Design a protein around this ligand. Structure first.
Ligand code: HEM
Ligand code: HEM
Ligand SMILES: [Xe]
Ligand SMILES: [Xe]
Ligand SMILES: [Xe]
Ligand SMILES: [Xe]
Ligand SMILES: [Xe]
Ligand SMILES: [Xe]
Lengths: 146, 146
């Protein structure tokens, strides 16, 4: 299937759940972005080496490169959320970020490692399994490009 | 380097002018982002070669990679606007994007070529030299990091 095919999973209900949870998670991009990355590295230690540009990714907010990365990642998510109703626009921004990951040899399966950290960050604001599942559908749009 | 000294130029008055103009420009990220890029390419044709990944940029909005790029650029600007309160956070996201441009061999002087396009896009929405000059101070923070 194509990336457009994958975006068919973003039904009205999935988009509502994405938007509702993002209103909260995206309101603290620094805090929740660094939490997302820290959780990735806590649970998926095999990924740490890919991030060597950032320095020591265990230093949390006392690592300016990690903070800058993490905030910017949250604006990638903001971008996706704002494009949900126009699959043409969603696909072209997904393809852009997919290239950022392809050129670093991140496979679709490796990209999907982010679902565990997303589930945990969601649950930190009491967004449960329905919301984690909705976010996995959005992650899968990127996986379709990888 | 002199990056923190550039960031210190974003006074309360400058920040207000950035926020007030961004309220309008950032309300159409697709349209104004592509306009910024097509204006850069038209007026600074010697920069087009750097963008070869995007294909034929003369196609404008109809070029999916250019559209994806352009939307994403506007979320870099959104990020900067949202960090204006906190010099450490503004600088760490500026440094992130500066690294992206250093990889592409973009100097402070060539990055500064965006000011003419910014002035033109602002003016098209009835934001004149006052606002162009505020945006130039923000551009100068990135220039200081290159
Ligand atoms: C929600 C999921 C994710 C989003 C939206 C995302 C977004 C981003 C963004 C915006 C960048 C910056 C690209 C650049 O400027 O070149 C980035 C860099 C990167 N991403 Fe992700 N990413 C995600 C998940 C992952 C996962 C799960 C991995 C690996 C297992 C990964 C590995 C990388 C690497 C290695 C970099 C480069 C870091 C650096 O050296 O600057 N990403 N990602
Ligand atoms: C307001 C000013 C600008 C902002 C906020 C900005 C932002 C961005 C962003 C967010 C990206 C994607 C980075 C990545 O994923 O690696 C990018 C890419 C790029 N930028 Fe800029 N940029 C600006 C001006 C310029 C100018 C003036 C030049 C050149 C003279 C330039 C040259 C490039 C190049 C060559 C790329 C890579 C395109 C590609 O192959 O994907 N940028 N820029
Ligand atoms: Xe991504
Ligand atoms: Xe999220
Ligand atoms: Xe995602
Ligand atoms: Xe930038
Ligand atoms: Xe702008
Ligand atoms: Xe900028």
């Amino acid at each position: 299937p194509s990336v457009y095919d994958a975006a068919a999973q973003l039904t009205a209900d999935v988009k509502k759940d994405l938007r509702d949870s993002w209103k909260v998670i995206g309101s603290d991009k620094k805090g929740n972005g660094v939490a997302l990355m820290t959780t990735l590295f806590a649970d998926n230690q095999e990924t740490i080496g890919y991030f060597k540009r950032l320095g020591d990714v265990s230093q949390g907010m006392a690592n300016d490169k990690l903070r800058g990365h993490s905030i910017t990642l949250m604006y990638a998510l903001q971008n996706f959320i704002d494009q949900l109703d126009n699959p043409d626009d969603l696909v072209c921004v997904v393809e852009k970020f997919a290239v950022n990951h392809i050129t670093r040899k991140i496979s679709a399966a490796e990209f999907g490692k982010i679902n565990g950290p997303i589930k945990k960050v969601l649950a930190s604001k009491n967004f449960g399994d329905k919301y984690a599942n909705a976010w996995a559908k959005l992650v899968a749009v990127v996986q379709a490009a990888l």
